[PDB]
Design a protein around this ligand. Structure first.
Ligand code: HEM
Length: 145
């Protein structure tokens, strides 16, 4: 049910993955500047120059499309998340806590831009908690507990 609650507000997100993706990453980097350093392509870009940066927005679109794919999955969520865990632990070297930070940002962006109400905010926190716990379990399988 919590997946359906989020999907009932996903229209404005999927309508413009570039704009909303850029909003999410711009806010992440503003509120959590240490996360920007985990993207070598973006690390060191002055904060004032991030909102207008097309490459940042394009990467945010990649993130949100992957999250959409997960939400819409009629099969295993864990299966889609295994490659994501593998790349984020072993290629990008992203500590798990950073997924909680981007999930905090997404809840706020959907509250502000996608009509996600109080119950929807809780549903999205629950869904992101499922995703993050699966990423964390897969990190542990790789030796990154
Ligand atoms: C649930 C949240 C996230 C989703 C859905 C997501 C999704 C993706 C996808 C689909 C890619 C491209 C394919 C791949 O390399 O696996 C990617 C790349 C990447 N992600 Fe994430 N990601 C998330 C969170 C994060 C966080 C929190 C960070 C760092 C704070 C991060 C850092 C990176 C980096 C550095 C790349 C490589 C970018 C490039 O070289 O172009 N990701 N992510």
């Amino acid at each position: 049910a919590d997946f359906d609650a989020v999907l009932k507000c996903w229209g404005p997100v999927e309508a413009d993955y570039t704009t909303i993706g850029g909003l999410v990453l711009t806010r992440l980097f503003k509120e959590h500047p240490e996360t920007q350093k985990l993207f070598p392509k973006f690390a060191g870009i002055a904060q004032a120059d991030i909102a207008g940066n097309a490459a940042v927005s394009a990467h945010g679109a990649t993130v949100l499309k992957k999250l959409g794919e997960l939400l819409k999955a009629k099969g295993s969520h864990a299966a889609i998340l295994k490659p994501l865990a593998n790349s984020h632990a072993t290629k990008h070297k992203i500590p798990i806590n950073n997924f909680k930070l981007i999930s905090e940002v997404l809840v706020k962006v959907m509250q502000e831009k996608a009509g996600l109400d109080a119950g929807g905010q809780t549903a999205l926190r629950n869904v992101m908690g499922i995703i993050i716990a699966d990423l964390e379990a897969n990190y542990k399988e790789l030796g990154f507990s």
